[PDB]
Every structure is written in structure tokens, then in C-alpha cells.
Ligand binder design. Structure first.
Ligand SMILES: Oc1ccc(/C=C/c2cc(O)cc(O)c2)cc1
Ligand SMILES: Oc1ccc(/C=C/c2cc(O)cc(O)c2)cc1
Ligand SMILES: Oc1ccc(/C=C/c2cc(O)cc(O)c2)cc1
Ligand SMILES: [Zn+2]
Lengths: 370, 4
């Protein structure tokens, strides 16, 4: 048996008497002594996801210590509630961090390579070894067989997509010099195309490719040929006999470290930002999902997503399609913001109207709290 | 320790 009773609270850095407190290392120590399966604790902390089987037990434990060590979630600031408050913030603020996800590329026409009915349908049909869409970006599977990734690559390649209202909005805030940084999890490289200057591409992009062995870098235009013919692009230097000599695009696959430029940028912007805005991301993947909990709690946070975030407390929640909400905010902002679109032939048949659900919530078109 |  073990020393722990299960009611302990694990601290990092009716209940009328204090519960015992353990460190995450002490906790995991105990569970090692019992020899409990880490997958269990992992399923208790994260019930909605299964760790890939190629994970050694010790790694899983390291992941558990990680999870247990994560910062305290932010208490919603009751000063800030309304969309009015929100625009007042977007005007007064001087060092704004914008955290984006696929929601800023919805209007751009990029297929859902994250859903199970998108490209994943035909790909799964062709490669039945693929468990789920995310495996398309699993580094171990890629090593094993990069075919599905490149059968898929040409579908989302950086040559044929146009920026959204959101991109343009962010780029404009950058011109005006209010944008401290735009952290994006997108790999579509549209942030650049829209002319945002201070971007950090947290999960990489198709901008370059690099051999798996010798780290030989090339431009996206060097590999574009092989990719559009659906041929796995090989390395120039590496001997042909070597099979893993593949030009892998520099997007952060699952199980890979994020670029050091990211961690640097976060350590800097950590104590400078005066407004955080999450746009078009539900924040499911770590460590990026940790960012809102990582900045000073007094900094106001604003959410612009299709769905609320259960695991996170924002001051103002605008729930709906991103471009719609952004458009609304533009109209309230005036100036170059109101002037901001070149594709409003599709925003003229989408409701301008929203419904306010006190004190925080606003429901726009394209929202789904299903 | 901070892998994606
Ligand atoms: O099954 C799972 C496999 C991997 C993970 C990743 C967890 C994680 C937690 C952190 O605090 C930081 C981080 O970089 C990663 C979670 C569950
Ligand atoms: O919140 C979530 C965070 C991550 C994931 C992806 C998991 C995953 C699935 C695979 O088949 C392979 C892999 O390397 C990772 C799913 C949900
Ligand atoms: O501290 C850590 C944080 C994260 C990880 C990642 C593990 C991992 C490995 C894979 O092949 C796929 C995956 O989806 C996740 C490991 C240690
Ligand atoms: Zn090579």
C-alpha cells in the first residue's frame, strides 16, 4: 500500500482543517514506490487524451511532473466585463500580445487538417496505420512513414491562401506600433503575407525545410517541387543509402521542442505586455496553452473564439466567428481599422448583430457552444 | 522539458 490517501493537494511554487500538502516530485516518488501505471495519473489529469504508445514510462512521469508544476490559473478581473471595456482596452493599451490559432485562417480556405473528416478521411483510407489527424504531425510516425504527411503537404502549402480580416487587423495594430507580439500556432505563414512584423511562429511553419540527419536547411521553394508531385523530398548531402535523409519542413511536430526564439520572446514579453488577446484558438496544446497563465494576472485578457475556454478565465468573452467579431471591433475602433477589408463581399451576408449575456459573454454569428 |  501507499502513504497517500488521494485527498492531498499537490503544490508547486467539507474541509475545515488543512489537507496534507505534497510536492509533485514527492507525489510521483510515492506512486513509483507503489509501481502505479503513469498512464493512469495522466488520464486523471488529462481525461480527454491518451498518450501515444511510443512513450516510455519515465517520460510519462516527466509529463506528469510537468502538469503538476504548471502555474496557477488566472482569476477573472471583475473590473473588465463588456465589449465597451474591451475596446477601451484596445485603445489605451500600448504593448499588446496577440495569441492566434486556426480561427484566424478560417475565412482563408485552408482545409481542416485537424478534423477527422477533412484530409484525414482520404489519408486514413490510403494509410490505415494513421490513428488520428494529429498523427499526421507526430514526429515518430513521420520518421516511420512520411508519406501521409507529404500526400497532405501540397494541400496546405503557403502559395495559395489569402490573409483574413484578423491577420489584417493584427498587421495594422503592428503598423500603429501597439503590437508587442503575435504568437501564432498556425503554420500557414499568412501572418507574414499580411505584413505582420513582430510574429513568433510557436509551432514553426513551411517557410523552411531541414534534413532529419545533417540539419541542412532549404527554402520552401526548394522543396515545393517534390511536394507538389507528391514525392518525399530527400537530402542533397546525405548518402542515398540512408533512408531517414528527408527534408522535413520546420514545423514543430508533436514531441518536438518549440523554437528557442519562442521561449526567448516569452521570457521578454512576460513582463511588458499590458493586454493579452487570444484569437481563434481553444488552447488545447501545451506549452502554448500555458501562456495565459504565465503572464501577470492583473493584465486584462480578452477572448475571441468560436467557443469559450473551460480551463481558462478571460475578462471579456466574444464568442463567434473570428472575422465577424474583429469586424465589429474595427467599426467600434474607427480610423484605419474601419477601413480594413478587401473581402467584405462575404461579411455583408453575415449578421452584424450579437447578443450580450452579462456580465462577460457576447454571442456572435458562427459561435457554437454545442 | 517543454516539448509540444
Ligand atoms: O498524453 C500526453 C502527452 C503529452 C502531454 C504534454 C504535456 C506538457 C505539459 C507541460 O506543462 C508542458 C509541455 O511542454 C507539455 C500531455 C499529455
Ligand atoms: O488537447 C490535445 C492535444 C494533443 C492531441 C494530439 C495527440 C496525438 C495523437 C497522435 O495520434 C499522435 C501524437 O503524437 C499526438 C490531442 C488533443
Ligand atoms: O517534458 C515533456 C513534455 C512533452 C513531451 C512529449 C512527448 C511526446 C512524444 C511523442 O512522440 C508524441 C507526443 O504527442 C508527445 C515529453 C516530455
Ligand atoms: Zn542530410
Amino acid at each position: 500500500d501507499n502513504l497517500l490517501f488521494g485527498d492531498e493537494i499537490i503544490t508547486n511554487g467539507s474541509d475545515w482543517t488543512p489537507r496534507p500538502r505534497i510536492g509533485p516530485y514527492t507525489f510521483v516518488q510515492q506512486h513509483l514506490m507503489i509501481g502505479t501505471d503513469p498512464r493512469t495519473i495522466l488520464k486523471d489529469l488529462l481525461p480527454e487524451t491518451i498518450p501515444p504508445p511510443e512513450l516510455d514510462d519515465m517520460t510519462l512521469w516527466q509529463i506528469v511532473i510537468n502538469i503538476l508544476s504548471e502555474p496557477p490559473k488566472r482569476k477573472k478581473r471583475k473590473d473588465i466585463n463588456t465589449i465597451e471595456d474591451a475596446v477601451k482596452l484596445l485603445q489605451e493599451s500600448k504593448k499588446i500580445i496577440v495569441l492566434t490559432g486556426a480561427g484566424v485562417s478560417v475565412s482563408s480556405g485552408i482545409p481542416d487538417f485537424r478534423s477527422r473528416d477533412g484530409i484525414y478521411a482520404r489519408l486514413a483510407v490510403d494509410f490505415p496505420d494513421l490513428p488520428d489527424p494529429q498523427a499526421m504531425f507526430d514526429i515518430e510516425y513521420f520518421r516511420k512513414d512520411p508519406r501521409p504527411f507529404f500526400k497532405f503537404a501540397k494541400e496546405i502549402y503557403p502559395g495559395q491562401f489569402q490573409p483574413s480580416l484578423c491577420h489584417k487587423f493584427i498587421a495594422l495594430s503592428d503598423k500603429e506600433g501597439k503590437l508587442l507580439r503575435n504568437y501564432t500556432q498556425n503554420i500557414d505563414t499568412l501572418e507574414q503575407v499580411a505584413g505582420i512584423q513582430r510574429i513568433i511562429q510557436c509551432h514553426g511553419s513551411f517557410a523552411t525545410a531541414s534534413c532529419l540527419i545533417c540539419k541542412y536547411k532549404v527554402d520552401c521553394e526548394a522543396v515545393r517541387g517534390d511536394i507538389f508531385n507528391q514525392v518525399v523530398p530527400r537530402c542533397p548531402r546525405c548518402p542515398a543509402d540512408e533512408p531517414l535523409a528527408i527534408m522535413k519542413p520546420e514545423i514543430v511536430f508533436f514531441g518536438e521542442n518549440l523554437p528557442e526564439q519562442f521561449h526567448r520572446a516569452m521570457k521578454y514579453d512576460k513582463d511588458e505586455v499590458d493586454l493579452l488577446i487570444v484569437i481563434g484558438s481553444s488552447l488545447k496544446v501545451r506549452p502554448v496553452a500555458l501562456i495565459p497563465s504565465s503572464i501577470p494576472h492583473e493584465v486584462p485578457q480578452i477572448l475571441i473564439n468560436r467557443e469559450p475556454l473551460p480551463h481558462l478565465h478571460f475578462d471579456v468573452e466574444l464568442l463567434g466567428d473570428c472575422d465577424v467579431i474583429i469586424n465589429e471591433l474595427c467599426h467600434r475602433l474607427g480610423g484605419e481599422y474601419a477601413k480594413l477589408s478587401s473581402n467584405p463581399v462575404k461579411l455583408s451576408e453575415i449578421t452584424e448583430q450579437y447578443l450580450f449575456l452579462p456580465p462577460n459573454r457576447y454571442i456572435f454569428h458562427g459561435a457554437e457552444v454545442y | 522539458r517543454h516539448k509540444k
